Ligand binder design. Structure first.
Ligand SMILES: N=C(N)NCCC(=O)O
Ligand SMILES: [Cl-]
Ligand code: NA
Length: 532
């Protein structure tokens, strides 16, 4: 089938693989991040991936309705919207920044190739020699003083950055327009958009290999520092990175499953999609970390102190690589066009899911002449208004609050744990596996059943508990200690997402009559579709 290609340009391959995984690996240390990544991909990632797709095919519906199997826990679906909504709030910003770089690519030279553009600190040198710890590369200067214009901290937002604001306006109007038409990338264009990224990456990787000091970068990427394994930071980062790269809990995998036919091979679908996501993430890791090793061997700073540890690494490693290509501006335009394509396809599927969920929720009395178009326009405008607080000088910090705490962190752990609990335990993991076998013919290995029943909830609960017990305040670029109210806002996002389940459960219990026993029994009775 081509369902893999359909997801490859959808809720799967994108910035979460090319932009996020590299900087998460860098922030947690190179080698030590892979082991929890692999373990949770085997135990948490692939199993919930297959769970979402299988449940989507089974229920023949997406977003909220799929939880008709356990209507009492239908609030989980609600949470998905909030989570994906938060993605739509900040994901686009990466695109915006990427778009800005693309706008700056179409020049006879490159703005970040050198620093003589009157937006750089005096401590910037284009070439490095044998003062010490007092020099910054032009690429990081451009990233932190033209795209971001980074302020002192979250306490002082500063002056709104107009250039990135027009770039974000262009991204949002483009999303509005080409989501209004609903292109869905057609059927033959997808082919190109599924093979254009890798080509570029491959080229970059080749260049990345042929550099002095790239071997050090690759070794640091692969060989792990076992001391960091005890830290819960790497475990929470790996679990959330997998649950984000797969769009687990965002209510897009479920719709993608619903699009498939009933007599489908969803088990191999999930396995192949997961392998593609992990392979693209590993390839992007190679591309980023070879460049990081090159900059470590060039500047002289340690490999862990080369570039930004926050979300800026993808904008400090990838552009740098481009500057080493023969015809730099053409390759900058090509790579950032690739990045724009990935981010755009992901944003299209996410916004489509959110809008369809909202439209299904709203009653008939709320119908408008252009209800779909007006709803999409209002969502885009509201998200742009929220992002107005993230393009400001002290805007990058807000982005981190929207990245670490919102649609990631303990939010995705909570969502995945409750998904596994409601399906494997409340609904019956054995019965669900029997239903999947009826759908698909054969029987998957019992490893999936063990992952659903015990392994995945246990791993998620353990990561959450060991992070909370040894809680460390979120620090951006290992320099800025977030104040109490910054963590308060981050936890406000997190609890806004994670309250959807318990509040909805409580409201359903109040609405039901009699004692809690028969109320739970009646509200957990599945509501099957017509075809079942
Ligand atoms: N939206 C997500 N949470 N994951 C999608 C991965 C991507 O295409 O970047
Ligand atoms: Cl990934
Ligand atoms: Na991904």
């Amino acid at each position: 089938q081509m369902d893999f290609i359909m997801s490859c340009v959808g809720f799967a391959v994108g910035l979460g693989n090319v932009w996020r995984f590299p900087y998460l690996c860098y922030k947690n240390g190179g080698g030590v991040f892979l082991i929890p990544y692999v373990l949770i991909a085997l135990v948490g990632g692939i199993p919930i991936f297959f769970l979402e797709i299988s449940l989507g095919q089974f229920m023949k519906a997406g977003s909220i309705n799929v939880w008709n199997i356990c209507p009492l826990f239908k609030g989980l679906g609600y949470a998905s919207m909030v989570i994906v909504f938060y993605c739509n709030t900040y994901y686009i910003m990466v695109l915006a920044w990427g778009f800005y770089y693309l706008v700056k690519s179409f020049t006879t030279t490159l703005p970040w190739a050198t620093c003589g553009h009157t937006w750089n600190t005096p401590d910037c040198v284009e070439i490095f020699r044998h003062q010490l710890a007092d020099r910054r590369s032009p690429v990081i200067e451009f990233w932190e003083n033209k795209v971001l214009r980074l302020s002192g901290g979250l306490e002082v937002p500063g002056a709104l950055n107009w250039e990135v604001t027009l770039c974000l306006l262009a991204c949002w109007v483009l999303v509005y327009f080409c989501v209004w038409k609903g292109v869905k990338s057609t059927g033959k264009i997808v082919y190109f958009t599924a093979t254009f990224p890798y080509v570029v990456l491959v080229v970059l990787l080749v260049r990345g290999v042929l550099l002095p000091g790239a071997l050090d970068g690759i070794i640091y990427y692969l060989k792990p520092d076992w001391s960091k394994l005890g830290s819960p930071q790497v475990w929470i980062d790996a679990g959330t990175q997998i649950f984000f790269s797969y769009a687990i809990g965002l209510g897009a995998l479920t719709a993608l499953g619903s699009y498939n036919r009933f007599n489908n091979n969803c088990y191999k679908d999930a396995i192949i999609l997961a392998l593609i996501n992990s392979g693209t993430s590993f390839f992007a890791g190679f591309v980023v970390f070879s460049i990081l090793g090159f900059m470590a061997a060039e500047q002289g700073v340690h490999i862990s102190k080369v570039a930004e540890s926050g979300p800026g690494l993808a904008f400090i490693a990838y552009p740098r690589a481009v500057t080493l290509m023969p015809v730099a501006p053409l390759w900058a335009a090509l790579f950032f066009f690739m990045l724009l394509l990935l981010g755009l396809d992901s944003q299209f599927v996410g916004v489509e899911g959110f809008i369809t969920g909202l439209l299904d929720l709203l009653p008939a009395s709320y119908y408008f002449r252009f209800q779909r178009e007006i709803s999409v326009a209002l969502c885009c405008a509201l998200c742009f208004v929220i992002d107005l607080s993230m393009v400001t000088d002290g805007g990058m910090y807000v982005f981190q609050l929207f990245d670490y705490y919102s649609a990631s962190g303990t939010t995705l752990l909570w969502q995945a744990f409750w998904e596994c609990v409601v399906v494997a335990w409340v609904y019956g993991a054995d019965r669900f596996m029997d239903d999947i076998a009826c759908m698909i013919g054969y029987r998957p290995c019992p490893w999936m059943k063990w992952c659903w029943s015990f392994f995945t909830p246990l791993v998620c609960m353990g990561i959450f508990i060991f992070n909370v017990v040894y809680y460390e305040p979120l620090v951006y670029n290992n320099t800025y200690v977030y104040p109490w109210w910054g963590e308060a806002m981050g936890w406000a996002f997190a609890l806004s997402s994670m309250l959807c389940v318990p509040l909805h459960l409580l409201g359903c219990l109040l609405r039901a009559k009699g004692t809690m026993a028969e109320r739970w029994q009646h509200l957990t009775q599945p509501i099957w579709g017509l075809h079942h």
